[PDB]
Every structure is written in structure tokens, then in C-alpha cells.
Amino acid sequence: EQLTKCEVFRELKDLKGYGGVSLPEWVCTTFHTSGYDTQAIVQNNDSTEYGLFQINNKIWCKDDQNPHSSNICNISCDKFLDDDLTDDIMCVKKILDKVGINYWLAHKALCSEKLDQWLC
Ligand SMILES: [La+3]
């Protein structure tokens, strides 16, 4: 499920300001993270990351690969592969509360400058 820049901008409104992250930062960060693909999956050895925000199955969500996940967002990872970003955003806030925006490696490098390019 491929979102446009403006759909992402609108669908992430409830993350505006959280941990000091601006909406243009969130649009920029999800672009570099998932290419606005809500069905995005990436694996690194025994780790899998799910959805627009690429939330991992070691700490944040449970799945069949890692049923012993810390599951801190108390959710099945497959809930991050649907079109509705409500529970994705609830989990992102818990990640921000516990680890911060640096969870998203793309953020510090690619999403500090010309943030005005990420407005709808
Ligand atoms: La969802």
C-alpha cells in the first residue's frame, strides 16, 4: 500500500510535536524508511521490521519468527502491514518514549536539512 507525500503528511498528524519531531521530519523519515509502503518488510539476520515505520520484532511487536519478543507495543507485527496507521502511531509514541527518534537511522542524516521540501 503506497501512500503519496500528502496522504502520509495527513495520516501522521497525531505524531506532530511528539519528542519534538515536526511533521516534515516524520514525512522525510518514513520516505527514507519504507518509501511510504505500509506493507514494507526488511530482515537483518534474525530481525524483521514491519510497515511504514519499520518496527522490529525483537523489542516492539510479536510474530511467528520471534514469539519471545519483548513485545513492548503489545501487538502482533502483522497489524503494521494494514492501511490504518492508528496502532502503528501508538507504537511509534512508545518507541519515542523509550528509545527516541534515533530508532530511525535515516532521521539524523537525511531529515535535518531543507525540511520545507517535506510539506504537502
Ligand atoms: La495498522
Phi then psi for 69, rounded to 5 degrees?
-45, 145
List residues bridging with 76 in a β-sheet. 62
| Residue numbering of the annotated binding site for Ca(2+) | 79, 82, 84, 87-88
What approach was used to elucidate this structure? Answer: X-ray
Asked if CATH classification 3.40.50.300 holds for the domain at 1-120, the reply, yes or no, is no
Resolution at which this structure was determined, Å: 1.9
Cell of 32: 527514507
Distance of CA 88 from the midpoint of ligand 1 (Å): 5
- Rounded CA-CA distance 7/3 in Å is 6
Cell of 45: 539476520
Among 87, 7, 2, which Cα is nearest to 37's?
2
Q: Where exactly are the structural domains of the chain?
A: 1-120
